């Protein structure tokens with residue numbers, strides 16, 4: 727493959743970060759807990775990976791969706807070892823909210839994106855069905871109400887929007903190429919959204935802050951992209967993991983331009 731494929735999540739304000747990399751059929755994990763990157767416990771087969779996580783109090787819960795073929799296995803971290811989850815259904819994208827939690831997993835397969843849903847009481851097939859060869863997702867809560875944005879790429883990236891009772895076509899536009907791969911993050915209540923697109927070896931960034939999409943400052947090489955972000959008070963921090971070949975570079979936004987991070991594969 728022209729590059730490894732990554733997925734990233736983060737929690738708290740330290741923060742802790744976990745980056746999962748699929749390389750030649752194996753997924754491994756690099757970890758940050760404030761004091762240097764290190765190799766994590768996670769090791770499972772897969773050509774494709776997505777991740778979501780949530781806190782209950784101080785306890786992290788992580789779900790990693792590892793795909794080989796149309797067989798996607800969910801791996802669970804709930805404080806004591808990676809365990810096999812109940813998910814059944816590929817390129818995937820995952821999001822979660824609340825503390826139950828609710829999870830949504832989107833799978834692009836043979837040009838179609840479909841959705842699997844967990845609301846505490848088993849997996850079911852969701853209402854979402856849209857064309858796409860590649861999918862990314864982000865979501866946010868506004869009080870009790872969930873908002874989901876799915877970025878479906880075919881031939882053009884279309885944004886699909888859930889805001890309480892149905893999927894609607896969003897205002898997102900970009901300049902894309904066939905085969906493009908995206909990653910998305912969001913923060914606050916407006917919200918702000920950032921969508922990163924890898925198009926023929928270049929990653930660019932489209933931005934929403936409440937009143938239209940604009941082209942962001944991020945511009946770095948890569949065939950594959952993942953992203954995570956966290957707030958410290960009102961200040962956003964973003965980490966973008968850009969891969970070309972087996973080289974993954976972390977790019978950092980901490981309020982004052984994009985800078986190179988300490989991330990290594992080691």
Ligand SMILES: CO[C@@H]1O[C@@H](C)[C@@H](O)[C@@H](O)[C@@H]1O
Nearest residue numbers: 744755757765766767768803
């Ligand atoms: C303490 O263990 C580390 O952190 C956990 C939350 C997991 O990411 C695990 O794979 C890693 O080795």
Ligand SMILES: CO[C@@H]1O[C@@H](C)[C@@H](O)[C@@H](O)[C@@H]1O
Nearest residue numbers: 789800802811812813827844
């Ligand atoms: C309690 O069940 C476990 O956690 C849920 C949040 C889901 O990830 C499910 O597939 C997994 O088996």
Ligand SMILES: CO[C@@H]1O[C@@H](C)[C@@H](O)[C@@H](O)[C@@H]1O
Nearest residue numbers: 830841843851852853854888
């Ligand atoms: C209530 O409907 C379910 O949850 C929503 C948040 C969406 O994920 C929808 O596609 C799904 O069927």
Ligand SMILES: CO[C@@H]1O[C@@H](C)[C@@H](O)[C@@H](O)[C@@H]1O
Nearest residue numbers: 875887895896897898917934
């Ligand atoms: C209000 O506008 C809708 O929600 C925003 C958060 C964006 O996702 C935008 O593209 C979409 O049309």
Ligand SMILES: CO[C@@H]1O[C@@H](C)[C@@H](O)[C@@H](O)[C@@H]1O
Nearest residue numbers: 920931933941942943944979
């Ligand atoms: C104000 O600048 C915009 O927002 C920042 C949080 C970054 O996403 C940057 O690339 C973008 O152009």
Ligand SMILES: CO[C@@H]1O[C@@H](C)[C@@H](O)[C@@H](O)[C@@H]1O
Nearest residue numbers: 741758965976986987988989
């Ligand atoms: C302070 O260190 C910077 O931020 C951390 C949260 C990590 O993303 C690290 O790789 C980066 O160099």
